[PDB]
Scaffold this active site. Structure first.
Site, PDB file in Angstrom:
ATOM      1  N   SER B 241       0.700  -1.162  -0.053  1.00 26.12           N
ATOM      2  CA  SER B 241      -0.113   0.086  -0.054  1.00 26.12           C
ATOM      3  C   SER B 241       1.068   1.465  -0.040  1.00 26.12           C
ATOM      4  O   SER B 241       0.599   2.074  -0.795  1.00 26.12           O
ATOM      5  CB  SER B 241      -0.833  -0.050   1.125  1.00 26.12           C
ATOM      6  OG  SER B 241      -0.073   0.139   2.371  1.00 26.12           O
ATOM      7  N   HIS B 271      -2.173  -8.624   2.291  1.00 25.40           N
ATOM      8  CA  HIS B 271      -1.716  -7.205   2.818  1.00 25.40           C
ATOM      9  C   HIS B 271      -2.599  -6.750   4.021  1.00 25.40           C
ATOM     10  O   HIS B 271      -2.023  -6.246   4.967  1.00 25.40           O
ATOM     11  CB  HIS B 271      -1.636  -6.255   1.848  1.00 25.40           C
ATOM     12  CG  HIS B 271      -0.909  -4.833   2.016  1.00 25.40           C
ATOM     13  ND1 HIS B 271      -0.167  -4.772   3.295  1.00 25.40           N
ATOM     14  CD2 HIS B 271      -0.607  -3.786   1.508  1.00 25.40           C
ATOM     15  CE1 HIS B 271       0.342  -3.508   3.261  1.00 25.40           C
ATOM     16  NE2 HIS B 271      -0.026  -2.910   2.129  1.00 25.40           N
ATOM     17  N   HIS B 317       4.654 -14.570  12.525  1.00 28.76           N
ATOM     18  CA  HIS B 317       4.737 -13.502  11.329  1.00 28.76           C
ATOM     19  C   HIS B 317       5.745 -12.486  11.855  1.00 28.76           C
ATOM     20  O   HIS B 317       5.743 -11.267  11.086  1.00 28.76           O
ATOM     21  CB  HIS B 317       3.362 -12.928  11.142  1.00 28.76           C
ATOM     22  CG  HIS B 317       2.406 -13.934  10.551  1.00 28.76           C
ATOM     23  ND1 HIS B 317       2.663 -15.391  10.452  1.00 28.76           N
ATOM     24  CD2 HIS B 317       0.993 -13.789  10.819  1.00 28.76           C
ATOM     25  CE1 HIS B 317       1.516 -15.685  10.172  1.00 28.76           C
ATOM     26  NE2 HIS B 317       0.678 -15.159  10.327  1.00 28.76           N
ATOM     27  N   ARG B 326       3.255  -2.460  19.104  1.00 28.46           N
ATOM     28  CA  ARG B 326       1.928  -2.128  18.552  1.00 28.46           C
ATOM     29  C   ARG B 326       1.013  -3.243  19.300  1.00 28.46           C
ATOM     30  O   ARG B 326      -0.292  -2.977  19.568  1.00 28.46           O
ATOM     31  CB  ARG B 326       1.607  -2.085  17.167  1.00 28.46           C
ATOM     32  CG  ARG B 326       2.540  -0.873  16.674  1.00 28.46           C
ATOM     33  CD  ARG B 326       2.571  -1.075  15.245  1.00 28.46           C
ATOM     34  NE  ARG B 326       3.045  -2.369  14.558  1.00 28.46           N
ATOM     35  CZ  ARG B 326       2.589  -2.859  13.496  1.00 28.46           C
ATOM     36  NH1 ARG B 326       2.254  -2.122  12.524  1.00 28.46           N
ATOM     37  NH2 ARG B 326       3.173  -4.032  13.065  1.00 28.46           N
ATOM     38  N   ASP B 372      -1.797  -7.000  14.556  1.00 31.85           N
ATOM     39  CA  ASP B 372      -2.969  -7.661  13.950  1.00 31.85           C
ATOM     40  C   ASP B 372      -3.799  -8.885  14.694  1.00 31.85           C
ATOM     41  O   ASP B 372      -4.801  -9.168  14.501  1.00 31.85           O
ATOM     42  CB  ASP B 372      -2.817  -8.098  12.499  1.00 31.85           C
ATOM     43  CG  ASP B 372      -2.654  -7.201  11.473  1.00 31.85           C
ATOM     44  OD1 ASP B 372      -3.040  -6.076  11.665  1.00 31.85           O
ATOM     45  OD2 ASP B 372      -1.581  -7.199  10.717  1.00 31.85           O
TER      46      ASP B 372
HETATM   47 CL   LIG Z   1       2.182  -2.896   7.508  1.00 34.50          CL
END
Ligand SMILES: [Cl-]
Ligand SMILES: [Cl-]
Lengths: 430, 433
Positions: B241, B271, B317, B326, B372
């Site tokens: 992106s 992504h 990952h 994060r 994530d």
């Molecule tokens: Cl990213």
């Protein structure tokens, strides 16, 4: 006879070629990465793999190893036509093989059957204001075509990785068929008061596009067939091809990759050279008259270049000889419009400026490219709206971009992840 | 000085000199090798582009202008009575490299709120698409509708000088950042709230206004959105992106065109789906094993799951030897605002059980989770359960980093991106000699 079956047979050998390149030569050095490349837009960096075309420094661009004159010799033409059919070029890029007359006709009828465009695509375009750029209306229409993407659903349904190219093939062939309908609809809306013309499945690809644009003349069909073929592909380093390949590497469907490619093609440094030449040629004919001698034009060319100005379409060449795509459009004009004043100035420029550019010594290659000649051909027959010319570029370039996107999934190419750095990091390394 | 454009104007010439000096003195310095594996593997391991707003520290995680996430949490101004860093202040940090005052953040908040006007044809463009259309498609199609008001396209058509390219680029980016939540919230309300659109509130800050337009007026969701937008705002330029927007921008396309193309890359399953994959997986685990699963039963489940050839979403990952900061900062939020949420307890227990199991198996480099693996349970807890929409929130947040770099791309006058392409015939011919 069928394109998908031909591709299915040809894929395993190139897959084996790819594995051998990793196993035998994976560590072979191709060059060095320097600070100039990271800050200068990867200038001089061999970075990606593009199989459908490669630029020959002696014979020009080669579509699967076939130069432009070779393509004009062996690619089938339409019945009652003389220019190479874009369908045959599309067959060449995907398979690497020159198609028969029957295979091109089968592919022509195949494209005509895939050209159905749902009503919400027209709704999406019509919702935009009339002031919207035609490339914006074009790209927005492609986003609407994404709703019918078959690779998106196939991936969500867990199709196998070795089968990724099959729904990519379907989406690309559907995209190639439907993009002219969207492109012509944008053209009719901005300039023909929304008087849309439906697609004719009896016509071939280039003629149906010319027909949907509002040009039924047989010579304009010949022009559009030649235009789509020669602008179809040009390596993968350009922004539009690289963008679609970059978005496609994240396993986005061809509609999203091509729509992103259009936004890159809409860049003034990428898809406006055609328009710059035509507008410049028209102002020269007004400032210097219609029948200006070559020697008076030579003085004009010399003063313009020494005044710090450039000649559009000239100087941008990386070929020792003139772009073969420029030559074939000159052949077209010499046969069908030798009395056109705008082409006559293009023809005189072809004789006068290359010697001037060589005498000044400021430019490496003094020869013109395809963008120096396409404007006068479109303008002559009635396609005068230069601001639309980049939409025509997009329709043609979809053939090359979609062909490589199929092999990206056929070859199973990985996600593109160049490493990023900051100026603090570069200064710390030095 | 409370003027953001004047702050950028003062800081540009030094960064321009940094680039010019870098070429003259070190332009020919070698940074690495180009190999066949790299050309065939998507430039893997190739240093290719310049991204100034952030850089990944292999020890402290991603750094926003040299400031890590915990460092950012300390000095970045927050909302009144709030503790999470305001995305406006983060945006100030990315643009200028300096931490803003409380007043500079408030000035930028009212600036963004005043730029958030969206014409009606943008909503018309989205509504023309079917309701079943992918949220990233309706979002990106809406961004294309915002492109009609681009000031860099018109300024270039009027022939402004190259050294002033950043000024209309600055206007488009801040205008894009201001309106992109309005379009994103409209897509959310249209797809999941039956078109019950919520207008923008000029009194609220950026993250609070987005949560407000999405339908969450609770202060705890606003705090979550402030933290979410801030930590997902940027992450280098190598991702698809960020690279896409930089690539489209190098052809001098306006920020709207670059960001819409960036979204199409962000919509890629490789992504922008890690957030969605984690939430869907844990909900299936809580349904297969019950709500209150013991830590030892989870080890039994994780062991059978991993040995069966399966992966644990959000884990493995990592490119950080330690846990992604994060992930940690969102764990701090959940430990404070939702410790009794059963789905978070499974994430928290996975945080304890999975890293040890992955190391014993020896198949994974870093067994620690990333952002994530934790953002889903936070959004899902407060009512944002539509996992398929989560990538739109990612896009709104990432616009801050992408647009910040797009301004400096024109401020630094960065050239067109033109990597050279080759074919397998050329590679095989280069290896036979
Ligand atoms: Cl990213
Ligand atoms: Cl090109």
């Amino acid at each position: 006879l069928d394109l998908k079956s031909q591709l299915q047979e040809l894929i395993p050998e190139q897959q084996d070629r790819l594995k051998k390149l990793k196993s035998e030569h994976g560590k072979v050095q191709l060059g060095n990465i320097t600070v100039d490349m990271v800050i200068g837009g990867m200038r001089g960096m061999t970075g990606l793999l593009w199989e459908t075309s490669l630029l020959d420094p002696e014979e020009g661009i080669r579509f699967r190893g076939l130069s432009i004159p070779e393509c004009q010799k062996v690619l089938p033409t339409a019945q009652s036509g003389a220019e190479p059919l874009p369908e045959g070029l599309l067959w060449l890029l995907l398979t690497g093989k020159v198609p028969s007359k029957e295979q091109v006709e089968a592919l022509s009828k195949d494209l005509a059957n895939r050209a159905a465009v749902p009503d919400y695509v027209y709704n999406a375009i019509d919702a935009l204001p009339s002031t919207a750029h035609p490339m914006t209306q074009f790209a927005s229409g492609v986003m609407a075509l994404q709703v019918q993407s078959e690779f998106q659903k196939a991936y969500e349904n867990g199709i196998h990785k070795s089968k990724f190219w099959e729904p990519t093939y379907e989406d690309c062939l559907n995209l190639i068929a439907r993009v002219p309908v969207v492109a012509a609809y944008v053209y009719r809306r901005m300039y023909k008061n929304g008087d849309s013309i439906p697609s004719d499945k009896s016509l071939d690809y280039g003629a149906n596009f010319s027909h949907m644009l509002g040009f039924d003349d047989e010579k304009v069909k010949e022009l559009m067939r030649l235009y789509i073929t020669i602008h179809s592909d040009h390596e993968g380093g350009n922004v539009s091809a690289h963008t679609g390949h970059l978005v496609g590497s994240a396993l986005s469907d061809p509609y999203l990759s091509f729509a992103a490619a259009l936004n890159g093609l809409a860049g003034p440094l990428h898809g406006l050279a055609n328009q710059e030449v035509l507008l410049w040629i028209k102002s020269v004919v007004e400032e210097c008259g219609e029948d200006i001698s070559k020697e008076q034009l030579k003085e004009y060319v010399w003063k313009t270049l020494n005044s710090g100005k450039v000649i559009p379409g000239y100087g941008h060449g990386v070929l020792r000889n003139t772009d073969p795509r420029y030559v074939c459009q000159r052949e077209f004009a010499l046969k069908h419009l030798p009395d056109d004043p705008l082409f006559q100035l293009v023809s005189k420029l072809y004789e006068v400026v290359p010697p001037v550019l060589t005498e000044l010594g400021k430019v490496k290659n003094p020869w013109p490219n395809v963008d120096a000649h396409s404007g006068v051909l479109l303008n002559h027959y009635g396609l005068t709206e230069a601001r639309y010319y980049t939409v025509l570029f997009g329709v043609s370039r979809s053939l090359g971009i979609c062909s490589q996107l199929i092999w990206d999934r056929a070859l199973g190419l990985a996600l593109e992840r160049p490493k990023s750095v900051t100026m603090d990091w570069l200064e710390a390394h030095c």
